Every structure is written in structure tokens, then in C-alpha cells.
Amino acid sequence: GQIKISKHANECGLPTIHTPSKTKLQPSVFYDVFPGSKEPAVLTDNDPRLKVNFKEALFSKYKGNTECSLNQHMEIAIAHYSAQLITLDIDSKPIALEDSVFGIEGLEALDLNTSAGFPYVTMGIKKRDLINNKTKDISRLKEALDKYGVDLPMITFLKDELRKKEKISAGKTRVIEASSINDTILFRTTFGNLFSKFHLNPGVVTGSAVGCDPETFWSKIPVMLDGDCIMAFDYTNYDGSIHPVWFQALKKVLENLSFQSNLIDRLCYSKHLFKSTYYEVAGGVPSGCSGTSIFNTMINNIIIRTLVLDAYKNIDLDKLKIIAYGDDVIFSYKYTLDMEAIANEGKKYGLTITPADKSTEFKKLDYNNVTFLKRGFKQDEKHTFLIHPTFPVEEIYESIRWTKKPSQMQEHVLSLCHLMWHNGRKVYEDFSSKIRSVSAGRALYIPPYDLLKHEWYEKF
Ligand SMILES: [K+]
């Protein structure tokens, strides 16, 4: 991604936006009970913890684009991925405004708690003021679409969340680039049936895990991804590193499904508003907004195919099975490929890819050490076709030590329990006892292991 334009907002017909510079994260009642070293992310230039300039850190996400063109290997990649997708017989017709608001089969209802974006943020107008959920009345929304129109700047919010210590010093706090409700409605209106089909068919034909429930989906992964060689790897700054050429490739895949392509240009060449700065960037996917997860997944599908083609002169793409969730990816081939060779092919395109899970070098992977959506794989000891999604124990301890809303510790703890029991019985009873080593913890309800185990079985 490359900042092409950076000017004062008032010079480009726009107001200054006011960023909350104060974390809601506060030490929880379990802070001293569990070990950890994560702290709330930096949200101001005035921050004792900093050791770098803050403004530079936020925008280094946009390093620049390499010189490259849509090559032959990409052309084969889009043809191959498109044939898979033509198999699903997706309806390329648009959906109705009411269905984009209140949801359809496969496409859940619009979240009414996320911000409505520009210009509503400037005048206190929230999503619930435009859309009434009990009346199902959306008169104000219709009024607001005609009035303010379409193709509005994305407001960039700092992400108030826990980070590792190293990332506090270096100013590495993440960003979300939230689109106006007017634009998310427009993308849902045009691409709604695409998103729907993807959500109902997670797996190796869509090549996506978007919308999946890992509690059931994990058992299905090892049958979809057959073939001896299990592969995965990490991307450094996936969103911001995606060259325009992958957006071109994406548009062609959508055209092969009979959708219009024009709207993807608004993600590739995007408009942004941070504080008092209007800026435009070429390349990069805007992190976390208008149907972003699905397009990121489709791009990853094009990238994996393309990189494997670049690395291996002889490959059968039909046996290259791929499951992606944005930048997260797990995949397989019918015999052993070299992850390091495939990784090296990313450099010419401006992609930086390294060994999976912070690993020092590329190592062979199977189901005892492979990770997807941060989760390992662990079979049930009785019914070995039922696979537990294993969540990392350290992240759970880290999360429970902090809170944005102390009155909701019960809900926070329930979330962590559903994650933790998969790791094992003994580990879960250890977590439970430590919670209950303190007054506030004894007061909370903790689901018995056997409750969780049978809720899980009564789910297949
Ligand atoms: K962009």
C-alpha cells in the first residue's frame, strides 16, 4: 500500500474527526491471579511507554508497492479458482435493501453496534437511529442514503486492545478502517449472494473458513485437506502489502461469476480520514470493513495458487487444496512441497511471508503442530474423528487479567471457558480453581467439564 495523497481534511471538504485517546481496559479482579505481560495498546502520542514516534508507526503499514504486472501464472490461478466457484451456481443478481439490513440465509443481519461511519459519527447518529429492529422500519436509513450518497471516506479508528510489550514501545497498535453504513449497504446489495454462498459452504470449493464454527469445522478440515503435505505460513502485514494486481485478479474472478467489478476499486484505491488528515492509498485492503473478510480470502486463494506455480513448474492445482480466512491459510498437496520455496516467490510481489507461528525456520507440519485461526488440532481419545480446536493457554490467561466493563466478568469468563476446555480436562479444572481462588471468582458460574463435553457431542 502507498499513500498517494495526504492533506488537511478541511482542504478536501471534510471535518476533523475526534479520536478517543484513552483506553477502556483496566486491570481485572484476576490480574494478580494469573500470569501475563500484555498491556493496553498505545492510543496517543502522549504515552510514557513509547520509544518511537507514534504517527510514523501507524502509517508504516503503507510502505509502497513493487513494480509488477498481472502475469501468466496469475491468469491460470484466476481461471482455476473461478471454475471451482462456478460450481456453486451463485446468484449474481443483487439483493434487496431490507435483506441487506435484516439478513438472509447465509448472510446474517447487519450489526447495529458497530459505528455507522462518516458522516454519522460527526453528529452523534448511530445505526439504531437509522434502523429500528422491533418495527423493522428503515425510513431514516433510506433518507440517509439518498442524502449523503455513496463512496464516502473510511474513518480509521485505533484498536483499543491488549498487545505484547514489544508492540507498545514500537507504537504497533492496529487500525480499523470503518466504512460508512451507506457503503457497506451498497456492497451487501451487490455482493450479498456471494457472501451468503461462502458462509454456507466453508471448505475446499470456496477455499474459505469465513463464518465457520471451529467446534464442528475442525473435524471436517482433515478430510477436505487430504494429501500428505500439510502446509501453512504467516504473512507480515497482509492487508497493507497487497499490490493492486491482486485486486485486478479479484475483479476478473468476480466477472467470471457475472458480478460487476467496479466496487473493488474503492477498496484498492481507497479514501481515508484519520483525525485532521484526509488520505488516499493505492494497494492494501482496508483492515476490517465492507465485506473485507471474503475478498481477502479470495485474494489469498489467488496468491497461494500463483506462488506455487512460480515455485513448481509441474503442479496439479486440482490437488492443491486450500482453506483461508483472510490472511490466515492452511493448505495441502498430494506430495511434499517446500514451504520456504513458495514463500520466496512472494517477495517480487511485495509479500513478506515467514514460517508459521513465529517459528524460526520453515519446519515440516502435520496435525500435531499445525495452527489455523490460532487453533491446534487434537482428536477426542474415544471418537478420534471428532477433533478439538485447541486454543493457546497463554492467550486465555492474558485476556482474563483485563476488562473494559467489570460488570460483565461472567460473560468474559464464559467465553474463555468455551475456548479452554478443548485443551483438556486437567487444564480446565486448573483454570477453574484459580478463578475460584478469589472472592469475585467464587461468585461466578463455571460450566462443569461434562456439561461442555456433551453440549459439544450433542452438536455433531
Ligand atoms: K487501499
Coordinates of C-alpha atoms and ligand atoms in Angstrom, one line a residue:
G1 CA 0.0 0.0 0.0
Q2 CA 1.1 3.5 -1.0
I3 CA -0.2 6.8 0.4
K4 CA -0.6 8.9 -2.8
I5 CA -2.5 11.9 -1.2
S6 CA -2.1 13.3 2.3
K7 CA -3.7 16.7 3.1
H8 CA -5.7 18.6 5.8
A9 CA -9.3 17.4 5.9
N10 CA -10.8 21.0 5.7
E11 CA -8.9 21.4 2.4
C12 CA -10.8 18.4 0.9
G13 CA -14.3 19.2 2.1
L14 CA -14.2 17.3 5.3
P15 CA -14.4 17.8 9.1
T16 CA -11.7 17.0 11.6
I17 CA -12.6 13.7 13.4
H18 CA -12.0 13.3 17.2
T19 CA -10.3 10.1 18.3
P20 CA -10.8 8.6 21.8
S21 CA -7.2 8.6 23.1
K22 CA -8.0 6.8 26.4
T23 CA -8.2 3.0 26.8
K24 CA -11.2 1.4 28.5
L25 CA -9.0 -1.5 29.5
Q26 CA -8.5 -1.8 33.3
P27 CA -6.8 -4.5 35.5
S28 CA -9.5 -7.1 36.3
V29 CA -10.1 -8.9 39.6
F30 CA -7.9 -11.7 38.2
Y31 CA -4.9 -9.5 37.3
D32 CA -2.8 -10.9 40.2
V33 CA -4.2 -14.4 40.0
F34 CA -2.9 -15.3 36.5
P35 CA 0.5 -14.6 34.8
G36 CA 0.9 -12.2 31.9
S37 CA 2.7 -9.2 30.4
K38 CA 0.4 -7.7 27.7
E39 CA -0.7 -4.1 28.2
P40 CA -3.4 -1.9 26.5
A41 CA -2.3 -0.5 23.1
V42 CA -0.9 2.9 22.7
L43 CA -3.6 5.4 21.6
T44 CA -1.8 8.8 22.0
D45 CA 1.4 10.5 21.1
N46 CA 1.5 11.4 24.8
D47 CA 2.4 8.0 26.1
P48 CA 5.1 7.2 28.7
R49 CA 5.5 3.7 27.3
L50 CA 6.5 4.9 23.7
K51 CA 10.1 4.7 22.4
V52 CA 9.3 5.5 18.8
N53 CA 7.3 8.2 17.0
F54 CA 3.6 7.3 17.1
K55 CA 2.3 8.9 13.8
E56 CA 5.1 7.2 11.8
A57 CA 4.3 3.8 13.3
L58 CA 0.6 4.0 12.4
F59 CA 1.3 4.8 8.7
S60 CA 4.3 2.5 8.1
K61 CA 1.6 -0.1 7.3
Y62 CA 1.7 1.6 3.9
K63 CA 5.3 1.0 2.7
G64 CA 4.8 1.2 -1.1
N65 CA 4.0 -1.1 -4.0
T66 CA 6.6 -3.0 -6.0
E67 CA 6.6 -2.9 -9.8
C68 CA 4.7 -5.9 -11.1
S69 CA 2.1 -6.8 -13.7
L70 CA -0.7 -9.4 -14.0
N71 CA 1.4 -12.4 -15.2
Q72 CA 0.6 -15.7 -16.9
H73 CA 0.7 -17.7 -13.6
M74 CA -2.0 -15.4 -12.1
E75 CA -4.1 -15.8 -15.2
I76 CA -4.1 -19.6 -14.7
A77 CA -4.8 -19.1 -11.0
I78 CA -7.9 -17.0 -11.6
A79 CA -9.2 -19.5 -14.2
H80 CA -8.7 -22.4 -11.8
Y81 CA -10.3 -20.7 -8.8
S82 CA -13.1 -19.4 -10.9
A83 CA -14.1 -22.8 -12.1
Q84 CA -14.3 -24.0 -8.5
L85 CA -16.6 -21.1 -7.8
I86 CA -18.8 -21.5 -10.9
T87 CA -19.6 -25.0 -9.4
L88 CA -21.7 -23.3 -6.7
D89 CA -24.1 -21.6 -9.1
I90 CA -24.1 -18.3 -7.2
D91 CA -26.9 -15.8 -8.0
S92 CA -25.2 -12.7 -9.4
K93 CA -28.4 -10.7 -9.1
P94 CA -28.4 -8.0 -6.3
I95 CA -30.4 -8.5 -3.1
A96 CA -33.0 -6.1 -1.7
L97 CA -32.2 -3.2 0.8
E98 CA -34.3 -4.8 3.5
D99 CA -32.5 -8.1 3.2
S100 CA -29.1 -6.5 3.3
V101 CA -30.2 -4.9 6.6
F102 CA -32.1 -7.7 8.3
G103 CA -30.2 -10.6 6.8
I104 CA -30.9 -13.6 4.5
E105 CA -30.0 -17.3 4.6
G106 CA -26.2 -17.3 4.8
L107 CA -25.8 -13.5 5.3
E108 CA -26.5 -12.6 8.9
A109 CA -28.2 -9.3 9.8
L110 CA -26.2 -6.1 9.9
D111 CA -24.5 -5.5 13.3
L112 CA -26.3 -2.5 14.9
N113 CA -23.4 -1.8 17.4
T114 CA -20.5 -1.1 15.1
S115 CA -20.2 2.6 14.1
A116 CA -22.1 4.0 11.2
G117 CA -19.0 5.8 9.9
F118 CA -18.9 9.1 8.1
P119 CA -20.8 11.4 8.3
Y120 CA -22.9 10.0 11.1
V121 CA -20.1 9.8 13.6
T122 CA -19.8 13.6 13.4
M123 CA -23.4 14.2 14.5
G124 CA -24.0 11.5 17.2
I125 CA -26.1 9.5 14.8
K126 CA -25.9 5.7 15.5
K127 CA -27.1 2.7 13.5
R128 CA -30.1 2.3 15.8
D129 CA -31.3 5.8 14.9
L130 CA -31.5 4.8 11.2
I131 CA -32.7 1.2 11.6
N132 CA -35.4 0.2 14.1
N133 CA -35.1 -3.5 15.0
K134 CA -38.6 -4.1 16.5
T135 CA -40.6 -2.2 13.9
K136 CA -38.2 -3.3 11.2
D137 CA -38.6 0.2 9.9
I138 CA -35.8 1.7 7.9
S139 CA -37.2 5.0 6.7
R140 CA -34.4 7.1 8.3
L141 CA -31.8 4.8 6.6
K142 CA -33.4 5.3 3.1
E143 CA -33.4 9.1 3.8
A144 CA -29.8 8.9 4.8
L145 CA -28.7 7.0 1.7
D146 CA -30.3 9.5 -0.7
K147 CA -29.0 12.5 1.3
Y148 CA -25.3 11.6 2.0
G149 CA -24.9 9.3 -1.0
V150 CA -22.1 6.7 -1.7
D151 CA -18.3 6.4 -1.9
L152 CA -17.6 8.2 1.4
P153 CA -14.2 8.3 3.3
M154 CA -13.4 5.4 5.7
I155 CA -12.8 6.6 9.2
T156 CA -9.7 5.0 10.7
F157 CA -10.1 4.1 14.4
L158 CA -7.3 3.0 16.6
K159 CA -7.9 -0.5 18.1
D160 CA -8.3 -0.5 21.9
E161 CA -7.0 -3.9 22.8
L162 CA -4.2 -5.8 24.6
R163 CA -0.9 -6.1 22.9
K164 CA 2.5 -7.6 23.7
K165 CA 5.1 -5.3 25.4
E166 CA 7.4 -5.1 22.4
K167 CA 4.5 -3.7 20.3
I168 CA 3.7 -1.0 23.0
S169 CA 7.3 0.5 22.7
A170 CA 7.3 0.3 18.9
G171 CA 3.9 2.0 18.6
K172 CA 2.5 -1.0 16.8
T173 CA -1.2 -0.5 17.6
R174 CA -3.5 -1.8 14.9
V175 CA -6.0 0.1 12.9
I176 CA -9.6 -0.4 11.6
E177 CA -10.8 1.5 8.6
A178 CA -14.5 1.6 9.0
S179 CA -16.8 2.3 6.1
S180 CA -19.9 4.4 6.2
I181 CA -23.1 2.3 6.6
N182 CA -24.1 3.7 3.1
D183 CA -21.2 1.8 1.5
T184 CA -21.5 -1.4 3.5
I185 CA -25.1 -1.5 2.4
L186 CA -24.1 -1.0 -1.2
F187 CA -21.5 -3.8 -1.1
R188 CA -24.1 -6.1 0.6
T189 CA -26.7 -5.1 -2.0
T190 CA -24.4 -6.0 -5.0
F191 CA -22.4 -9.0 -3.5
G192 CA -24.8 -10.3 -0.9
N193 CA -25.5 -13.7 -2.6
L194 CA -21.7 -14.2 -3.0
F195 CA -21.1 -13.7 0.7
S196 CA -24.1 -15.9 1.5
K197 CA -22.8 -18.9 -0.5
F198 CA -19.3 -18.5 1.0
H199 CA -20.8 -18.6 4.6
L200 CA -22.9 -21.7 3.9
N201 CA -20.1 -23.6 2.2
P202 CA -16.9 -23.3 4.2
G203 CA -14.3 -25.6 2.9
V204 CA -12.2 -26.5 -0.1
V205 CA -14.5 -25.4 -3.0
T206 CA -14.9 -21.8 -1.8
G207 CA -11.5 -22.1 -0.3
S208 CA -12.7 -20.3 2.8
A209 CA -13.4 -20.7 6.5
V210 CA -15.2 -17.4 6.8
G211 CA -18.3 -17.7 9.0
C212 CA -17.2 -21.2 10.2
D213 CA -17.8 -22.7 13.6
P214 CA -14.5 -24.2 14.6
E215 CA -16.2 -26.6 17.1
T216 CA -17.7 -28.6 14.2
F217 CA -15.5 -27.4 11.3
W218 CA -12.3 -28.7 12.8
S219 CA -13.4 -32.3 12.3
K220 CA -14.1 -31.6 8.7
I221 CA -10.7 -30.0 7.9
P222 CA -8.5 -33.2 7.8
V223 CA -11.0 -34.9 5.3
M224 CA -11.1 -31.9 3.0
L225 CA -7.3 -31.3 3.2
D226 CA -6.2 -34.8 2.4
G227 CA -2.8 -35.4 0.8
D228 CA 0.4 -36.0 2.8
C229 CA 1.8 -32.5 2.8
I230 CA 0.0 -30.1 5.3
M231 CA 1.2 -26.5 4.8
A232 CA 0.7 -23.2 6.5
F233 CA 2.6 -19.9 7.0
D234 CA 2.5 -16.4 8.3
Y235 CA 2.2 -13.1 6.5
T236 CA 3.8 -9.9 7.8
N237 CA 1.2 -7.1 7.2
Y238 CA -1.0 -9.0 4.7
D239 CA -3.7 -6.3 4.5
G240 CA -1.3 -3.4 3.7
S241 CA 1.0 -5.4 1.5
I242 CA -1.5 -6.4 -1.2
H243 CA -0.5 -5.0 -4.6
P244 CA -3.1 -3.5 -6.9
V245 CA -2.5 -6.5 -9.2
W246 CA -4.3 -8.9 -6.8
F247 CA -7.3 -6.6 -6.9
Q248 CA -7.3 -6.8 -10.7
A249 CA -7.1 -10.6 -10.4
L250 CA -10.0 -10.5 -8.0
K251 CA -12.2 -8.4 -10.3
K252 CA -11.7 -10.9 -13.1
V253 CA -12.9 -13.8 -10.8
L254 CA -16.0 -11.8 -10.0
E255 CA -16.6 -11.0 -13.7
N256 CA -16.4 -14.7 -14.4
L257 CA -19.2 -15.2 -11.9
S258 CA -21.2 -12.4 -13.7
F259 CA -20.9 -9.7 -10.9
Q260 CA -19.8 -6.2 -11.7
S261 CA -16.2 -5.3 -10.6
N262 CA -16.3 -1.5 -10.1
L263 CA -16.8 -1.5 -6.4
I264 CA -13.4 -3.4 -5.7
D265 CA -11.6 -0.2 -7.0
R266 CA -12.9 1.5 -3.8
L267 CA -11.0 -1.0 -1.7
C268 CA -7.9 -0.9 -3.8
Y269 CA -7.7 2.9 -4.3
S270 CA -9.4 4.0 -1.0
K271 CA -10.3 7.2 0.8
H272 CA -9.5 7.7 4.5
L273 CA -10.0 10.1 7.3
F274 CA -7.8 10.0 10.4
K275 CA -8.0 12.9 12.9
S276 CA -7.4 16.0 10.7
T277 CA -5.9 14.2 7.8
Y278 CA -7.6 13.1 4.6
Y279 CA -5.5 10.5 2.7
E280 CA -5.8 8.1 -0.2
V281 CA -3.9 4.8 -0.6
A282 CA -3.2 2.7 -3.6
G283 CA -2.9 -1.0 -2.9
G284 CA -3.7 -2.7 0.5
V285 CA -7.0 -4.0 1.7
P286 CA -8.7 -1.6 4.2
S287 CA -8.5 -3.5 7.6
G288 CA -11.9 -4.7 8.8
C289 CA -14.9 -3.4 6.9
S290 CA -17.3 -3.7 3.9
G291 CA -17.2 -7.4 3.1
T292 CA -13.5 -7.4 3.6
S293 CA -13.1 -10.9 5.0
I294 CA -14.5 -12.6 1.9
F295 CA -12.4 -10.6 -0.6
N296 CA -9.3 -11.2 1.4
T297 CA -9.9 -14.9 1.3
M298 CA -10.5 -14.9 -2.4
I299 CA -7.2 -12.9 -2.9
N300 CA -5.4 -15.4 -0.7
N301 CA -6.7 -18.2 -2.9
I302 CA -5.3 -16.5 -6.0
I303 CA -2.0 -15.8 -4.1
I304 CA -1.4 -19.4 -3.0
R305 CA -2.1 -20.8 -6.4
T306 CA 0.2 -18.2 -8.0
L307 CA 3.1 -18.7 -5.7
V308 CA 3.0 -22.5 -6.1
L309 CA 3.0 -22.0 -9.9
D310 CA 6.0 -19.7 -9.6
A311 CA 7.9 -22.2 -7.4
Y312 CA 7.0 -25.5 -9.2
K313 CA 6.9 -25.9 -12.9
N314 CA 4.8 -29.1 -12.6
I315 CA 1.8 -28.8 -10.3
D316 CA -1.8 -30.1 -10.4
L317 CA -3.8 -27.2 -9.0
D318 CA -6.8 -29.6 -8.6
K319 CA -4.8 -31.4 -5.8
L320 CA -3.7 -28.1 -4.2
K321 CA -6.4 -27.9 -1.5
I322 CA -6.8 -24.6 0.2
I323 CA -8.7 -23.1 3.2
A324 CA -8.2 -19.5 4.0
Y325 CA -9.7 -16.9 6.4
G326 CA -8.3 -13.6 5.1
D327 CA -4.6 -13.8 5.6
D328 CA -4.9 -17.0 7.7
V329 CA -4.3 -20.0 5.5
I330 CA -3.9 -23.8 5.7
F331 CA -3.4 -25.9 2.6
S332 CA -2.3 -29.3 1.2
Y333 CA -0.7 -31.0 -1.8
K334 CA -0.6 -34.7 -2.9
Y335 CA 3.2 -34.8 -2.2
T336 CA 5.8 -32.9 -0.2
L337 CA 6.3 -29.3 -1.3
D338 CA 8.8 -26.9 0.2
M339 CA 7.1 -24.1 2.1
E340 CA 10.3 -22.0 2.0
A341 CA 10.4 -22.1 -1.8
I342 CA 6.8 -21.0 -2.1
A343 CA 7.4 -18.2 0.5
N344 CA 10.3 -16.8 -1.5
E345 CA 8.1 -16.2 -4.5
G346 CA 6.1 -13.6 -2.6
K347 CA 9.0 -11.1 -2.4
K348 CA 8.7 -10.0 -6.0
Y349 CA 5.0 -9.1 -5.4
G350 CA 5.7 -7.2 -2.2
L351 CA 4.5 -10.0 0.1
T352 CA 6.6 -10.9 3.2
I353 CA 5.9 -14.4 4.4
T354 CA 7.7 -16.3 7.2
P355 CA 7.4 -19.7 9.0
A356 CA 4.1 -20.4 10.7
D357 CA 3.6 -19.4 14.4
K358 CA 6.6 -17.1 14.9
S359 CA 8.8 -20.2 14.1
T360 CA 12.5 -19.5 13.5
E361 CA 12.7 -21.6 10.3
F362 CA 10.4 -23.5 8.0
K363 CA 9.6 -26.9 9.5
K364 CA 7.5 -29.8 8.4
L365 CA 3.9 -29.7 9.5
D366 CA 1.3 -32.3 10.3
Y367 CA -1.9 -32.2 12.6
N368 CA 0.1 -32.3 15.9
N369 CA 1.8 -28.9 15.3
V370 CA -0.3 -27.0 12.6
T371 CA -2.3 -24.0 13.5
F372 CA -5.3 -22.3 11.9
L373 CA -7.2 -19.3 13.4
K374 CA -4.7 -19.6 16.3
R375 CA -6.0 -23.1 17.0
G376 CA -4.3 -26.5 17.1
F377 CA -5.9 -29.9 16.4
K378 CA -6.4 -32.6 19.0
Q379 CA -8.5 -35.7 18.5
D380 CA -11.0 -37.0 21.0
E381 CA -9.4 -40.0 22.7
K382 CA -12.6 -42.1 22.3
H383 CA -14.1 -40.9 19.0
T384 CA -10.9 -39.9 17.0
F385 CA -12.9 -38.5 14.1
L386 CA -14.1 -35.7 16.4
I387 CA -11.3 -33.0 16.5
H388 CA -11.0 -30.4 19.3
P389 CA -9.9 -26.9 18.3
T390 CA -7.0 -26.2 20.7
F391 CA -6.8 -22.6 21.8
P392 CA -3.5 -21.3 23.3
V393 CA -3.5 -21.4 27.0
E394 CA -1.2 -18.3 27.4
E395 CA -3.7 -16.1 25.5
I396 CA -6.6 -17.0 27.8
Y397 CA -4.6 -16.1 31.0
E398 CA -3.5 -12.8 29.3
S399 CA -7.1 -11.9 28.4
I400 CA -8.8 -12.5 31.8
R401 CA -6.4 -10.1 33.6
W402 CA -8.1 -7.1 32.0
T403 CA -11.6 -5.8 31.4
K404 CA -13.4 -2.9 29.7
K405 CA -16.6 -3.5 31.7
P406 CA -16.2 -5.2 35.2
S407 CA -20.0 -6.0 35.4
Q408 CA -19.5 -8.4 32.5
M409 CA -16.8 -10.6 34.0
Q410 CA -19.3 -13.5 33.9
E411 CA -19.7 -13.3 30.1
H412 CA -15.9 -12.8 29.6
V413 CA -15.2 -15.9 31.8
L414 CA -17.8 -17.9 29.9
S415 CA -16.0 -17.0 26.6
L416 CA -12.7 -18.2 28.0
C417 CA -14.3 -21.5 29.3
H418 CA -15.6 -22.5 25.9
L419 CA -12.1 -21.9 24.5
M420 CA -10.2 -23.6 27.3
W421 CA -12.0 -27.0 27.9
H422 CA -10.9 -28.2 24.5
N423 CA -7.3 -28.2 25.6
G424 CA -8.1 -30.9 28.2
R425 CA -9.9 -31.9 31.5
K426 CA -7.0 -31.3 33.9
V427 CA -6.1 -28.0 32.4
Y428 CA -9.7 -26.8 32.6
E429 CA -10.1 -27.8 36.3
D430 CA -6.8 -25.9 36.9
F431 CA -8.3 -22.7 35.2
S432 CA -11.5 -23.1 37.3
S433 CA -9.7 -23.5 40.6
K434 CA -7.5 -20.4 40.0
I435 CA -10.6 -18.3 39.1
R436 CA -12.2 -19.6 42.3
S437 CA -9.1 -18.8 44.5
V438 CA -10.6 -15.3 44.9
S439 CA -14.0 -13.9 46.1
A440 CA -15.1 -12.4 42.8
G441 CA -14.3 -15.7 41.1
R442 CA -16.2 -17.9 43.6
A443 CA -19.3 -15.8 42.8
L444 CA -19.2 -16.7 39.1
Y445 CA -20.8 -19.7 37.5
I446 CA -18.2 -22.0 35.8
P447 CA -19.6 -24.7 33.4
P448 CA -18.6 -28.2 34.5
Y449 CA -16.4 -30.0 32.0
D450 CA -19.0 -32.7 31.3
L451 CA -21.6 -30.0 30.5
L452 CA -19.3 -28.6 27.8
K453 CA -18.3 -32.1 26.5
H454 CA -21.9 -33.1 26.0
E455 CA -23.0 -29.8 24.5
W456 CA -20.2 -30.5 22.0
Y457 CA -21.3 -34.1 21.2
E458 CA -25.0 -33.0 21.0
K459 CA -23.7 -30.7 18.2
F460 CA -22.5 -33.2 15.7
Ligands
K1 K -6.4 0.5 -0.4

